Amino acid sequence: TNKIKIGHVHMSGCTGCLVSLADNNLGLIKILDDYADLVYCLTLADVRHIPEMDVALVEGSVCLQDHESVEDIKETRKKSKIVVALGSCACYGNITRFSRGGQHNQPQHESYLPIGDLIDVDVYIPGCPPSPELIRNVAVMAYLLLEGNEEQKELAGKYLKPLMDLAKRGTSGCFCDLMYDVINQGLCMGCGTCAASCPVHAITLEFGKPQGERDLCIKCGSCYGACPRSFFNLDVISEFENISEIIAKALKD
Amino acid sequence: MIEDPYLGKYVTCVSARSTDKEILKKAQDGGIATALMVYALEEGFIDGTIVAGEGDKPWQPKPVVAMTREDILKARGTRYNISPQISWLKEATRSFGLDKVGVTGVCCQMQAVRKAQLYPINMRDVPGKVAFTVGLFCMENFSYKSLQSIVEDHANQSLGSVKKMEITKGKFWVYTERGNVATVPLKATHKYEQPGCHVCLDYVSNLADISTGSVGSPDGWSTVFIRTKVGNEIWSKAVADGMFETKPIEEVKPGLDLLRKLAKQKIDKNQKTVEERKTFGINKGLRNPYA
Amino acid sequence: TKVVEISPTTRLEGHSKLTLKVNDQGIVERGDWLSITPVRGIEKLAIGKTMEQVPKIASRVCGICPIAHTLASTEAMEASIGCEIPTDAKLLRIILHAANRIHSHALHNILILPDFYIPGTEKKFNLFANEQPARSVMARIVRIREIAQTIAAIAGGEAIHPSNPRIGGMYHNVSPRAKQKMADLAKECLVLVHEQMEFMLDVIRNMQNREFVEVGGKQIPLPKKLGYHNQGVMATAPMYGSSSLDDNPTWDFTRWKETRPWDWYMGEVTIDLEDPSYPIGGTTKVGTKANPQMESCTGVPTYDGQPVEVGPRARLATFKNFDEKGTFAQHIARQMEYPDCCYTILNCLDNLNTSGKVLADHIPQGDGSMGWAANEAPRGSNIHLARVKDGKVRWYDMLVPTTWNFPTCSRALTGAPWQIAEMVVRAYDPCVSCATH
Amino acid sequence: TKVVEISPTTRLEGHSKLTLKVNDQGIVERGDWLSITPVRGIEKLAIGKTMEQVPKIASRVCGICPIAHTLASTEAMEASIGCEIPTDAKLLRIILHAANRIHSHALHNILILPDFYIPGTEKKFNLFANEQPARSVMARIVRIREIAQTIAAIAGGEAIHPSNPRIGGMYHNVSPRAKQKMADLAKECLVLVHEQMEFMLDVIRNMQNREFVEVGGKQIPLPKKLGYHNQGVMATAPMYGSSSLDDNPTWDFTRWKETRPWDWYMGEVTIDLEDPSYPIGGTTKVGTKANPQMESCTGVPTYDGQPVEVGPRARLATFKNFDEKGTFAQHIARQMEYPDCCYTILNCLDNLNTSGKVLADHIPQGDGSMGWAANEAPRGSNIHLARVKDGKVRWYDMLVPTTWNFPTCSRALTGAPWQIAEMVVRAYDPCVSCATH
Ligand SMILES: Cc1cc2nc3c(=O)[nH]c(=O)nc-3n(C[C@H](O)[C@H](O)[C@H](O)COP(=O)(O)OP(=O)(O)OC[C@H]3O[C@@H](n4cnc5c(N)ncnc54)[C@H](O)[C@@H]3O)c2cc1C
Ligand code: NFU
Ligand code: NFU
Ligand code: SF4
Ligand code: SF4
């Protein structure tokens, strides 16, 4: 089989998503060596225009008043088999939800939307910053989905399904996810995972129940993602020891 | 009742200016917006009104509930950046204890009031206490940073020296207190406009009781539309009381011909924008508040 | 004069372009390097928000240097409200700061080496390639960045967007075991950064001895004074920074003024020179209109009425009177900063009391007074200014290193063959998301 | 070695000459630039006079920079007596100061351009001539100086010998209308000085690319290191100055000592080389005796026992580590100071309270204590020192920029062809009436 073709597309992002990918260290070099060709990434390489990609890792949101940005995100959908919203800005808007214009030297750059409001998104990788391990798992599994035996492609499709469901669920992320869709649904069981995942310490547990500092929350969508009562896909997660060994072998020298 | 497709619904249109020489000293145009609110207060049609007062930075407006002739006059002259007039609409009926609220503002602010009157959403007591609205013509507005950039850079003027600003004859004009004049081609200002103005389908404040503006009238005069029964009662009385000089608009150049054409260009350009929102993405579009 | 334009730039952070007037030989007469990154507008959206939230939003300006905005923003709040943080909080912030400088300088090694030559040869580094010596260099860089991110995560709570800093100090002190782990890693890192530093200095010295470089198959001459400018430099500390709480602050806000690009950038031009062979995808089509004054996305901060250079060379020039200028001098000064980072971490760990307090006992809420804080980010002086009143941000302003370097680097472009204008740019280690915020 | 002498110098302020030993090629081996302006003796006549009178006499040392002596003298009195002036007095003094720097730098453009070339040509600027481009340049310079003098007159009371400064602050605050007028003029001036600055920098860059210049019909080679010296620089502020009232003064009087010309100048020589064709009137007749030690009219202030350079390059080198030296570097640094003047005026006007107090409520009469004040005059650090007792000046001393630059520029003459020794001199923007006082 061939290596799949992967691009990193940079919209209104901070490059922390790219840094997260790079923080797989020799893992990334192993993937680039054996499974994937980086065909486009302005930060790392000199390909100036968006080429065709099997997988586009798209970070950042879209500024509606920046013509080239709107064209880039449409061109990306047109050029890509699989579009991945990489990180919470691409998935959910994140800190650019708060953008409201008025700053030099483009006071009209006022409106930012997650990429899923402008194009169809196949896969979400939520997180701010996203976990290096997640970006790696998704790249490996995308390779298996495209180049593996049908036993692998079956595993890969089952692994990615909840990240594809997230992309179909919507383009909003907030502390309030845990109210709306977990506590208010009768699904919260007080494990406290949301509090560990929150990057800004906006979540405490009081008598076993989430308490959200909404004016600290930066709307990244991490806590609903990590909650074991958002998606819990038993067919994958109960096979954790096996899937771990499979991923590890794919990275071994 | 004329029902014009670009100038909205109205009973008459005249060219007018206030007979109050104190008001005219600092009015942008004819002094219609100030004269109508002062008169409404002294006659008791209103007991207070929302006007764009002076704010904390030069040429930045601050909405305020004015309840005296003196406080109304402080709001004279056009501030070409955003003044959130409607933020005091409910409060005017609470701690201010008003029974008859006046509102001044531009076309979208007139729309906000009428929406509040028909669909009050946590706007208790507002439908029945709105007593009088005067709407300004408005082609587009700017953030304060936009206005600073235009005046300080493009016109090379200090904001603290500016006496009047005026968009007319294709140029953004700056008049200083010491007597100088600077202009900027409107083409240079386009990047700075507030983006939400680009879906606006209303030029001459279609939904106000009385609408007033500059285009169609010579300098020092205003083009005025009298639209609603409220608007007609107050205007008739005010004219009868000596408050205004008038001229039928069709005896005035350039008059309603130019005005109806500028209204048409605004609506057509912004209706196109509204249309392009629908297919803005790939197999996806942006929201249309008018849908 | 003709006008050529490279858009986008590459092997730098974020989105910019070069709009260049060139003479009959293709040498830049006057070039503008400008941001075309959309303005997310952090300074305006900050108004009314809590002083606890604004630093964590400001962190998301940039994922390479989030330490710089987290600390400068927090310490601007602390300076405005008059909050003095505990010693052990300060030590942990310094460890976080030094660690991040290591990871950033090492990342920039990856971005610039493809322009550089294996010494004594005509082969350029291709770091993707699984061949020597590139692969052993990549292995070293990769371990350096891993160590640095790990230390950052332990002292700062997260390597990207650190969670441990808060108004008044830190959420957490570290365990005795974590303190030992940071020391063990810094010992390892110190040997590695000494090796990487010597390697990079050798590569740069070889560049300084070359007469030409190859771009798109053509020989491009290397000017002796590549990247020289006359703007001088600005720096507030060799390592950490300074704030208005200090007895003798090392930055002078009465010398600063910020203009729009207007005062310093070219107006409308039309591209009439195009090279479709420029690697990889060519330059802007002939006939395109450009207008740097209007397209530039940044403000232009000045010091004594002029743009200045910030960053590692600015720090070495200010604090040791380092006396080389231009592109290769900038590269040299950056590599020379590697060892201070590891010695500083080890000295800070030696003084850190893992039982010590990390949060001030009293956090005032502010009366509207102005305070400011400078952090010496990897790319240079990062100055945040704030007025906090009743725990809310009433006024906020950010003067970020690449913002300062944008007009200065533009001026340094004069004299360069337009095909290596991008090499002049990369010596500034640009972060265009930072510059724009 | 032969000895040639140019007397008088031209296109500078006041009366000096160049007494030059040259090698067989006509290159200066050792040259002395010296004042031959009569000593009006301001420091000695000051003794016993009132502290109110002495600054107004000191103003009349020089009509180009009277602001510098008015302010340095007044603030030396204020420093000796311990008088703290009101904020709005200080703001008005800064506006006065910045305005005058504009007029002086622009006047110096008129003096130096006849040595410079219309870029890419062999024609030199003749600013008298009613032809382009000289006439449009003159029109811009003339409006710049007019604006500057006008602002100076409004804030300072008079453009030449300002009347508004007094012990304790100012005689007058300005009206709301005057404040608007100064802002309007500064807005206009800022655009103009940006244009003039870019014009001058282009002209200087062209000079740096020339191999020769024409003097008296002959080609004179242009050395690469024209005007280089090893004295280093001294500066007290990038804009205004410093005084002994400050918490941390930026000038150190224990490092200063003033000698007679004796220690630094040549003794008796005889001119044996004469060029009657030197434009326009030739050089000193063969056989003339000269003695710089005895004919020099100035004292020689030193810093750490050596002459130093002061002025715009000294300020940019001290405060931004500007790193170019010599004649064209001096010219560059001076033009770069244009915009700070206009931004400073506008910022000061923005902070000026036109109802605010301008005179200290109490003016002490002094007990004989020494105080000092430095003003960064357009030509460099102007330091006045005083002991005031019972309202009278008991001791007075003046270290004026061109006084400092006289021995330093002399040393910079080495290596120049004697026919462009005067170009080395003019980069110092000499004020010989200032240097002598
Ligand atoms: C953004 C803006 C765009 C405009 N564009 C046009 C145009 O294209 N064509 C045209 O003919 N007229 C336009 N106008 C109206 C015109 O500039 C005058 O405001 C109008 O003629 C009323 O003048 P006057 O003499 O009657 O009022 P004055 O007696 O001078 O009183 C001024 C009135 O204007 C209100 N006002 C001033 N600034 C604002 C503001 N920012 N926001 C809300 N209300 C404000 C005040 O509350 C007060 O009621 C515009 C006005 C604004 C604010
Ligand atoms: N280093 C750095 Fe940032 Ni991504 C920049 N420029 C800033 O503070
Ligand atoms: N500038 C200036 Fe003067 Ni006429 C000199 N030298 C001084 O203070
Ligand atoms: S998701 Fe977070 S780390 Fe990724 S681009 Fe957005 S701010 Fe940066
Ligand atoms: S992670 Fe989910 S189930 Fe666990 S405490 Fe938080 S909301 Fe409740």
Ligand code: SF4
């Ligand atoms: S509460 Fe924390 S994890 Fe959840 S959306 Fe907000 S910032 Fe993200």
Ligand code: SF4
């Ligand atoms: S153009 Fe429309 S939306 Fe914009 S300020 Fe004027 S009336 Fe309001």
Ligand SMILES: [Fe+3]
């Ligand atoms: Fe900023």
Ligand SMILES: [Fe+3]
């Ligand atoms: Fe003296």
